[PDB]
Amino acid sequence: KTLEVWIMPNSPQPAEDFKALVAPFEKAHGVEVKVTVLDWGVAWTKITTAATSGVGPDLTQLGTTWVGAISAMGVLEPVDDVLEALGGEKAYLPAVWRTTRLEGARQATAVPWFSELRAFYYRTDALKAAGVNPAEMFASWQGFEAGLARLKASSFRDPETKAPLAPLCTPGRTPRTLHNAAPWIWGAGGEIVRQAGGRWQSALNSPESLEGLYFFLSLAQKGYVPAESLEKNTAQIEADFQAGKCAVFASGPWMIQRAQVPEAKGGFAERTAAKNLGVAPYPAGPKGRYTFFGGSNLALFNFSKNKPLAKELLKYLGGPEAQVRYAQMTGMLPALRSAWSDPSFQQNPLLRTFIQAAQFGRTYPSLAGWGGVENLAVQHLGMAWDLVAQGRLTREALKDLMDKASAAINQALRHH
């Protein structure tokens, strides 16, 4: 009677890392845990097929934004008991607690596993050369844009590339998520959706959502993001920062680990970027400072024949030791807030800065139809990036694109 867990590729050797993570559990319970790794490309279909058919694992990883949809299909075992065992609501950042259930539900259907959050990496050497104070640049929108202007004008050249750096790298081609836009929307006082007028509705066409989205998108149109960045994807921009092409770029905590180890093990300790690496939280907008939170949770299918032992494994994976260990393996932040005290975070100044950024964490409402909302939002955000690529984004053009986004989202939110 052996547990079956489904995971996605969260670490360099996903199945073996997971098996090393649960070795102490296996010993204590006299059990083997079986793991299957699902590519992110097919994980959603595999998990919805398990949901509809009843053919699946005991435990599955879920992206945080998936919890509403799978919970609303009726297939997840309540895990309030597990979360209470881990410390209950105060054991988590509120944005992370929000991901434990369908929005508005009283019963928890998912256990927080690990957190993606995003902050700005910068080249300490580039900002020093351009006369930019990092505290000022990453404090506010005005500091941020003034910084990028100084970096655009800087005579500084990367030691290894012998070329100027792009002030900001951000991808403009084929956006799959709102995660790079959301902090700007939120900082302006906006949101992606809201409860207004008795309904969930798009808030992308609100003046405040448009202010934040225009502020961000216009940086690229002012020459702070080179056309070559605009043209690209998400591991390219990490490769670009590593390769000394970008002064500033947003990423998660995994780049810190990578900066600390040589090319041998898949790091960039050798590159000028590793030796001149800073991190700062997103700047405050006019209506607040917000950090995007994502990541993954664990869930138990209620058709499992080993729910008792599966709940023990959720307690283990969700708990302090496994939280610290799996954060190291994945390069993510623990979902269990107590684990942030661990020396592995507190002895690394760049990881302490991520924990500073964590205090401002926010995430999307846990809606059953969240995926439809985000798919329509990203499609229209990509239309906006396309106007940037032509230098044709105006405030009126962005407003028109988000009014079309909002009609489509509102229609999708009226259907289940």
Ligand X SMILES: O=S([O-])[O-]
Binding site for ligand X (CB under 6 A): 406-407, 410-411, 414
Q: Which is nearer to Cl ion, 10 or 99 (CB)?
A: 99
Does 289 bind Cl ion (CB under 5 A)? Our answer is no
Rg (CA), the chain: 22
Q: Which does 362 bind (CB under 5 to 8 A by kind): ligand X, Cl ion, none?
A: Cl ion
How near is the Cβ of 407 to ligand X at its closest, in Å? 4
Nearer to Cl ion, 130 or 377 (CB): 377
Residue 104 burial (10 A CB sphere; 0-12, 13-18, 19+)? exposed
Which of Cl ion, ligand X, none does residue 244 bind (CB under 5 to 8 Å by kind)? none
Q: Where are the beta strands (DSSP E) in 223-290?
A: 246-251, 277-280
Sign, CA dihedral 358-361-363-366, equals positive
Whether 17 and 71 have beta carbons less than 8 Å apart is answered as no
Distances (CA, A) of 149 to 152, 153, 168, 248: 5, 6, 10, 12
Question: Among positive and negative, which fits the CA dihedral 140, 143, 146, 152?
Answer: negative
* Closest distance to ligand X from the beta carbon of 209 (Å): 15
Interface segment toward Cl ion; rule CB under 5 A; list 154-162, 275-283, 323-331, 354-362: 354-362
Minimum distance from CB of 408 to ligand X (Å)? 8
Complex with ligand X: residue 197 or 343, whichever CB lies closer: 197
Q: Which of 95, 237, 317, 322 binds Cl ion (CB under 5 A)?
A: 95
Q: Measured between alpha carbons, how far is 354 from 352 in angstroms, rounded to an integer?
A: 5
Closest separation in Å from C-beta 350 to ligand X:
43
Q: How far is the CB of 182 from ligand X (least distance, A)?
A: 21
Q: By CB under 5 A, is residue 335 in contact with Cl ion? A: no
| 366 vs 63: CA distance, rounded Å | 11
Is the Cβ of residue 338 or residue 410 nearer to ligand X in the bound state? Answer: 410
Tokens of residue 121, six digits: 């990496």
Instruction: Pick out residues in 183-242 that bind Cl ion (CB under 5 A).
Output: 191-192
Strands 119-123 and 246-251: antiparallel
Q: Note the residues at the interface with Cl ion (CB under 5 A).
A: 95, 98, 175, 180-181, 191-192, 362-363, 394-395
